[PDB]
């Protein structure tokens, strides 16, 4: 797709049996092709006894067929095709789609078409193949069982109530996957898989005459059988105020919404294209306005947004959603209904509509005179979109002319009328998500309409106007400090500078910095420092990171950085504070200047704070009764005895004030800093900027913060609380070992080989292991080899998995082969020399060096790292990866 190809020539056809095809010839990259077939059947067409059958047929048509009794995907493998790269399929509510990218492009077109015709017209759907395949469909189902899917099903259930969608999820049930016989799949195939229910599109380097012959060859003989007529794609819209709870015990969702459902494709006798353009203008106007209405929200509600979505072929949902402070759902739904009422009473901002309409006209103008040229993958993207909805493609040049035509028939009166139609839709829905165990009784419809009538009768202020944009500028800094000492490490190209405020600079003049300056500012101000309140310090760090300096805002901070191509981020860990940033060398004063302003003039953006409190509070409510909440608590007790700190109660959360947080930040900002600066410039250029912006920041000595250290010993625990049918097995082990680069390298090698050995030694598929992980490192701050072995598996033999891994660990130090080390040493040498000149690696090693030696020696003599990899050393270290004296085992089983 290197040279863009122009708008292609399209040829369409219909075989006698009703099979439709679309041929799209690109000047295109040479020989590349893309071949799609759609069968117009999805899970919505399943009957009550056919749960998930559409998706199972999708799998099964790659099995035995009349011409390939060993399976269609078997032959595809033989001829070089790869699962997911060369062939793929997807099933959704309404269609099943098969996609092919033959490895040899257009030369395999006949082969591809033979394969597709086999799948769609000659699949055997054999019981014996199905019993083999249902293990693969059950895995697909297990990996789909999280909170995100259960909540998605909650959303479909509510917003698509009174339709076929809620009872027809694509995957179907574990019962049907396990019990449904091939005979049911066969009847479904024979009901729906007929040529007039099918269409095919071929894109790329093709001769349309030749492709049409291959298509006649492989599809013309398929018998012309009708499929049932269907008119059940829409929810049954009726006047109503439905109330729903969106609920899952593992979800932190905390949210109210009010939703309008309506026929969105009805253009009311006017232009379909013009209608869609009215929708874009309106949604853009409403999106602009509803953001300004944030000023009107009470403390219980935030981030009110408007979202429009398809919920059928013709039905759409227009919804107002807002985040809710847990326990404030009643106040929040009222606040949402108040704003909806305000939109019913005032017209949309005329200037917004003027501007938005003008932006569109400028793009439609450019489109209408620019010749359309795209890369291959982009052509495929554009064309599949229109083809999936069974519509002809209209080029961007023609569509620019159509927009300009429609824009001439569109005044703000139309936009307002378009918008008020939506808000007058009689089919309505109110939704509540209330996290955890928050007291909640679902409002009755009358309670909701009561609030509607209260606001319909109320006096309401006009829509908010656009606020002036604040244009941030860094202050002038006239005071200067001084460098008071220089220590030189010429062999590493490093200078170390003491500054008058007690900070220091570690400056590496690395040519690899190019025309950029890289800053890492560290200090001992982690949130576990003695003077701080842990949770509040952490919230403070996050709020200042997003807000920027006192007189700025989160948004203006983000624009200002983009305009200077500059980054700077706060990260407060338990034991240290790191501010990291990059800028072009010409922007140095802006990088240092912003750094200093975060230190002495931090800001708290009131909207950011309100949003962060809601995030913390809904998570608190969820974590207090969630599975993950209990696992975190149990792992914490097993490994540490007590939590180092905790989140507060929601009631304390509500009371936190900006000055209390800024107090915490200033405590962190006062610990003295080491500036790791990587910049290829002369000292004379860097020193004045360091003395002006960095040596002038007030500091007081900080103490080193004690590490949170996992306790010695052997302890275990087993909890049957998992809501999904899986077992989670975690095991932790550690051995104190002094850190050196050599020792750290040996641990990583031992863990590579141990990873291989422990995965074959537990390779038996009867154990039921879905996922397995062996992690081990010589943690340099704690100076201990920490090892972590994780399993996710079927419950039945989960109690055997750690025993077998413990087994495999005891064997490992003698089973390690000289050949094993040889290929690791060789592959390490490859990665190490790939890391030469790597800025990230250089930065990390400069900081490691200073942490452990208080000098930059580690930047030299990386070459003799490889030399520490031997059989005798890797094995001596493989013995220390697991320490039976320090072993914590935690087993989560499905709930009883």
């Amino acid at each position: 797709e290197e040279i863009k190809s122009p708008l292609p020539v399209f040829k369409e056809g219909t075989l006698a049996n009703g099979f439709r095809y679309t041929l799209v010839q690109l000047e295109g990259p040479k020989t590349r092709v893309d071949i799609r077939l759609i069968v117009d059947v999805g899970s919505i067409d399943e009957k009550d006894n056919e749960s998930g059958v559409a998706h199972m047929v999708e799998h099964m048509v790659f099995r035995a067929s009349d011409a390939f009794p060993q399976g269609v995907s078997t032959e595809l493998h033989k001829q070089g095709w790869g699962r997911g790269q060369s062939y793929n399929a997807v099933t959704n509510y309404e269609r099943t789609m098969y996609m092919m990218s033959p490895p040899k492009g257009n030369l395999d077109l006949g082969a591809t078409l033979q394969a597709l015709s086999q799948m769609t017209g000659h699949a055997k759907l054999l019981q014996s193949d199905l019993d083999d395949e249902r293990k693969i469909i059950l895995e697909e189902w297990r990996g789909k069982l999280g909170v995100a899917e259960r909540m998605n099903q909650q959303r479909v259930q509510a917003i698509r109530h009174d339709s076929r969608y809620p009872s027809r999820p694509v995957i179907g049930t574990e019962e049907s996957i396990n019990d449904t016989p091939a005979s049911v799949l066969q009847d479904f195939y024979q009901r729906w898989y007929h040529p007039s229910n099918m269409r095919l599109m071929i894109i790329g380097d093709i001769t349309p005459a030749d492709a049409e012959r291959e298509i006649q060859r492989y599809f013309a003989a398929l018998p012309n059988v009708a499929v049932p007529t269907r008119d059940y794609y829409e929810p049954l819209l009726k006047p109503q105020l439905k109330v729903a709870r969106l609920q899952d015990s593992q979800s932190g969702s905390s949210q109210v919404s009010f939703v309008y459902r309506f026929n969105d494709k009805d253009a009311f006798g006017q232009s379909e294209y013009r209608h869609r353009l009215l929708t874009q203008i309106t949604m853009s106007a409403v999106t602009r306005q509803v953001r300004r209405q944030k000023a009107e929200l009470p403390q219980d509600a935030s981030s009110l947004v408007v979202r429009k979505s398809d919920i059928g072929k013709t039905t759409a949902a227009l919804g107002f959603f807002a985040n809710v402070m847990p326990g404030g759902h009643d106040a929040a739904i009222s606040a949402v209904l108040k704003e909806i009422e305000r939109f019913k009473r005032y017209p949309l901002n005329e200037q917004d509509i003027t501007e938005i309409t003008s932006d569109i006209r400028e793009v439609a103008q450019r489109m209408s005179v620019t010749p359309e040229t795209r890369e291959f993958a982009d052509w495929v993207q554009q064309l599949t979109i229109v083809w999936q909805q069974d519509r002809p493609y209209v080029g961007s040049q023609q569509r620019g002319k159509d927009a300009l035509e429609a824009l001439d028939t569109i005044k703000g009166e139309d936009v307002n009328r378009h918008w008020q139609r939506w808000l007058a839709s009689p089919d309505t829905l109110a939704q509540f998500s209330v996290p955890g165990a928050t007291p909640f009784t679902l409002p009755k419809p009358d309670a909701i309409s009561k609030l509607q009538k209260q606001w319909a009768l109320a006096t309401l202020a006009p829509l908010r106007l656009e606020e002036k944009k604040i244009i941030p500028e860094l202050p002038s800094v006239t005071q200067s400090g001084k460098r008071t000492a220089v220590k030189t490490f010429a062999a590493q190209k490093v200078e170390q500078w003491q500054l008058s405020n007690g900070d220091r600079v570690v400056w590496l003049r690395a040519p690899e910095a190019g025309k950029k300056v890289y800053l890492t500012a560290t200090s001992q101000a982690g949130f576990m420092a003695t003077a701080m309140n842990p949770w509040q310090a952490q919230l403070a760090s996050q709020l200042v990171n997003q807000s920027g300096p006192a007189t700025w805002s989160g948004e203006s901070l983000s624009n200002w950085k983009k305009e200077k191509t500059l980054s700077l981020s706060i990260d407060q860990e338990a034991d240290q504070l790191t501010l990291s940033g990059t800028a072009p060398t010409e922007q140095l004063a802006s990088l240092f200047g912003l750094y200093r302003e975060l230190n002495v003039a931090p800001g708290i953006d009131p909207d950011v704070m309100k949003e962060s409190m809601m995030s913390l509070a809904r998570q608190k409510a969820n974590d207090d009764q969630s599975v993950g909440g209990k696992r975190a608590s149990e792992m914490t007790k097993l490994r540490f005895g007590e939590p180092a700190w905790q989140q507060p109660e929601i009631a304390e959360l509500k009371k936190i004030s900006a000055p209390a947080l800024l107090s915490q930040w200033h405590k962190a900002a006062s610990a003295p800093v080491t500036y790791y600066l990587i910049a290829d410039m002369p000292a004379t250029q860097l020193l004045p900027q360091v003395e002006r912006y960095l040596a002038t920041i007030p500091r007081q000595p900080a103490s080193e913060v004690k590490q949170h250290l996992a306790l010695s010993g052997k302890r275990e625990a087993t909890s049957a609380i998992n809501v999904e049918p899986r077992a989670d097995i975690l095991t932790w082990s550690f051995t104190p070992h002094a850190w050196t680069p050599q020792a750290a390298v040996q641990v990583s090698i031992a863990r590579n080989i141990a990873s291989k050995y422990l995965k074959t030694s537990l390779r038996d598929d009867a154990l039921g292991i879905y996922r397995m992980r062996v992690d081990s490192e010589l943690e340099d701050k704690k100076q201990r080899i920490e090892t972590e072995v994780s399993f996710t598996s079927a419950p039945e033999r989960a109690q055997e998995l750690w025993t077998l891994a413990e087994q495999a660990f005891s064997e490992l130090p003698t089973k390690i082969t000289q050949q094993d080390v040889d290929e690791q040493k060789a592959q390490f040498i490859r990665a190490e020399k790939g890391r030469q000149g790597d800025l990230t690696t250089i930065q990390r090693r400069l900081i490691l060096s200073y942490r452990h030696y208080n000098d930059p020696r580690y930047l030299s003599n990386a070459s003799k790292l490889a030399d520490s990899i031997t059989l005798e050393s890797v094995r001596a270290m493989s013995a220390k990866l697991y320490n039976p004296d320090n072993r914590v085992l935690y087993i989560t089983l499905p709930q009883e």
């Binding site: 294209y273 869609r276 353009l277 929708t279 874009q280 793009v363 569509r399 927009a403």
Partner: peptide, 7 residues
């Protein structure tokens, strides 16, 4: 949906 992409 966006019928004419602007950004």
């Amino acid at each position: 949906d966006v019928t004419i992409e602007t950004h």
